[PDB]
């Protein structure tokens with residue numbers, strides 16, 4: 001099974017998942033001087049109910065906060081999107097070093113880490129699964145994390161990480177104010193792309209927030225203490241879980257701001 005180790009890592013994903021070599025793969029390098037300001041883009045409009053979060057788990061590839069996507073309590077609207085996209089899940093990417101952890105890279109700069117908020121198009125598709133397979137199916141909001149002062153909005157998550165050391169472990173997790181974790185400014189870049197983990201489906205409209213949020217070194221280190229292995233299996237740590245940037249192949253990266 002795929003992972004981020006020598007033998008199963010990004011460079012090998014294409015053996016098992018051919019679309020790894022597609023023309024709309026993510027993440028990318030965002031070169032700010034080449035991005036175009038699009039006055040036709042709309043402001044992001046976000047409503048995230050703290051009662052939506054239910055469960056935190058170790059997938060073996062990140063932690064995953066799972067949200068009740070039965071109805072439309074928690075949604076993303078606006079930006080480049082047509083209609084309403086329903087909140088499904090949150091996870092984080094990091095690397096083994098604090099200066100090289102994000103998936104998206106801005107003018108050569110890699111952040112300490114990158115939070116992904118995953119949503120699906122409930123206005124057009126009946127379920128996350130059906131949406132995941134369409135070009136306008138999914139929308140992922142990306143937030144960069146930079147090293148600095150500890151972030152009290154991450155305490156809720158970090159406090160759970162011991163209980164989910166092993167791959168597969170899960171713990172109830174509710175009253176999670178995801179809105180308060182986002183940066184104060186919602187200016188963004190957007191481009192059409194893919195999942196950054198197998199199955200690597202090209203169904204994602206990426207919305208990458210310009211403004212990072214803080215994390216301490218000590219907070220980030222706690223994530224690398226998660227295992228990519230299950231109970232009663234040789235232990236290996238998830239020290240790194242980001243995919244290298246992929247070729248743009250002529251796609252247009254747009255900015256909500258000038």
Ligand SMILES: COC(=O)c1ccc(SCCc2ccccc2)c(S(N)(=O)=O)c1
Nearest residue numbers: 061062091116118132140195196197241
């Ligand atoms: C290391 O990162 C992850 O663990 C991770 C998990 C889920 C997802 S999205 C849902 C994947 C999925 C699986 C099966 C079917 C349809 C969608 C992503 S991402 N970076 O937004 O592309 C990362």
Ligand SMILES: [Zn+2]
Nearest residue numbers: 091093116196
């Ligand atoms: Zn992700």
